[PDB]
Amino acid sequence: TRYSRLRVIAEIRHNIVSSIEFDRDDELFATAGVSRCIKVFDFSSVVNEPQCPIVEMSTRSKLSCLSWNKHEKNHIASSDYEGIVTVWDVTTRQSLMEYEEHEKRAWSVDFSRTEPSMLVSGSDDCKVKVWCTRQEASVINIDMKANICCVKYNPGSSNYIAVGSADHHIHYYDLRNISQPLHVFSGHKKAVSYVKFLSNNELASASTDSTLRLWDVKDNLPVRTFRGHTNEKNFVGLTVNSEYLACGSETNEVYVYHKEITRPVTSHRFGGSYFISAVCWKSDSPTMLTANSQGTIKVLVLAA
Amino acid sequence: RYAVVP
């Protein structure tokens, strides 16, 4: 009841944007995708102005994902279609680390919130790699049996990662003993394209079966399935906060779900054949960043 | 093909 619409409060008119992410203070955000350019914008400027990035970093390969460091304000990691995982400093524009062990496209990178020098990546090479920014070689390698589409650290401990796999399952690992996952969550009928935590115990996933799912990683239980959007092919984005899930759709629409309700609380038509390609909440607030396959960026806000 | 899930 609280919200029925998404209001557009800003738009940057444009190339697919595969990732849009806020820095540790929700002050800057970065975008990246097929154009081989990591662009950094000032959020307040975008909201207030009638819009140029403050930093642009050219890359050798198409980008699949970004993750800002949670301690070092100025550091951001990228994964690319060559398999390289790069840590960048947005003030100097330099690559700080270039991790080159993946043999195929890396789809995901995630910096840990609680051990901020640690970052994890997953790849079409079927490996999960854990890296430490002070070391050139990977610290942990998990050999899996299928392409890895997303890896995410638990927000409360760097010992746990969720792995979304093309085998249709979420593999939840304790990195202190990688012999077997703690649990493998089955329920999706197609590849699991995203995993994101609402809290220490609540995990959400997206899949090309046109569903989102909510899972309890304390008691290893399925919770809820969310339906309404169309997602049979593309990476269309998933972002969650403590209460809400948002995802893209192949209908060029953003969908929002409350975690307790299986059908959308609202949706927004972006304004064919376009798809939403990236979404990111501004922490626990009703404000979110969104981008689509044309490269348009919008700042949206849930509203009554 | 870009941004296509395996």
Author numbering:
A (entry chain A): 351 to 364, 372 to 407, 411 to 631, 643 to 675
B (entry chain B): 406 to 411
What's in the article?
The COP1 E3 ubiquitin ligase is a central signaling hub that integrates inputs from plant light‐sensing photoreceptors. COP1 contains an N‐terminal zinc finger, a central coiled‐coil, and a C‐terminal WD40 domain, which is essential for proper COP1 function (Deng et al, 1992; McNellis et al, 1994). COP1 regulates gene expression and plays a central role as a repressor of photomorphogenesis by directly modulating the stability of transcription factors that control the expression of light‐regulated genes.
The WD40 domains of human and Arabidopsis COP1 directly interact with VP‐containing peptides (Uljon et al, 2016). Such a VP peptide motif can be found in the UVR8 C‐terminus that is not part of the UV‐B‐sensing β‐propeller domain (Kliebenstein et al, 2002; Rizzini et al, 2011; Christie et al, 2012; Wu et al, 2012), but is essential for UV‐B signaling (Cloix et al, 2012; Yin et al, 2015). In order to compare how the VP peptide motifs from different plant light signaling components bind COP1, we quantified the interaction of the UVR8 and HY5 VP peptides with the recombinant Arabidopsis COP1349–675 WD40 domain (termed COP1 thereafter) using isothermal titration calorimetry (ITC). We find that both peptides bind COP1 with micromolar affinity and with HY539–48 binding ~ 8 times stronger than UVR8406–413. Next, we solved crystal structures of the COP1 WD40 domain–VP peptide complexes representing UVR8406–413–COP1 and HY539–48–COP1 interactions, to 1.3 Å resolution. Structural superposition of the two complexes (r.m.s.d. is ~ 0.2 Å comparing 149 corresponding Cα atoms) reveals an overall conserved mode of VP peptide binding (r.m.s.d is ~ 1.2 Å comparing six corresponding Cα atoms), with the central VP residues making hydrophobic interactions with COP1Trp467 and COP1Phe595 (buried surface area is ~ 500 Å2 in COP1). COP1Lys422 and COP1Tyr441 form hydrogen bonds and salt bridges with either UVR8Tyr407 or HY5Arg41, both being anchored to the COP1 WD40 core, as previously seen for the corresponding TRIB1 Gln356 residue in the COP1–TRIB1 peptide complex (Uljon et al, 2016). In the peptides, the residues surrounding the VP core adopt different conformations in UVR8 and HY5, which may explain their different binding affinities. Mutation of COP1Trp467 to alanine disrupts binding of COP1 to either UVR8‐ or HY5‐derived peptides. Mutation of COP1Tyr441 to alanine abolishes binding of COP1 to the UVR8 peptide and greatly reduces binding to the HY5 peptide, in good agreement with our structures. Our analysis of the isolated VP peptide motifs of UVR8 and HY5 suggests that UVR8 cannot efficiently compete with HY5 for COP1 binding.
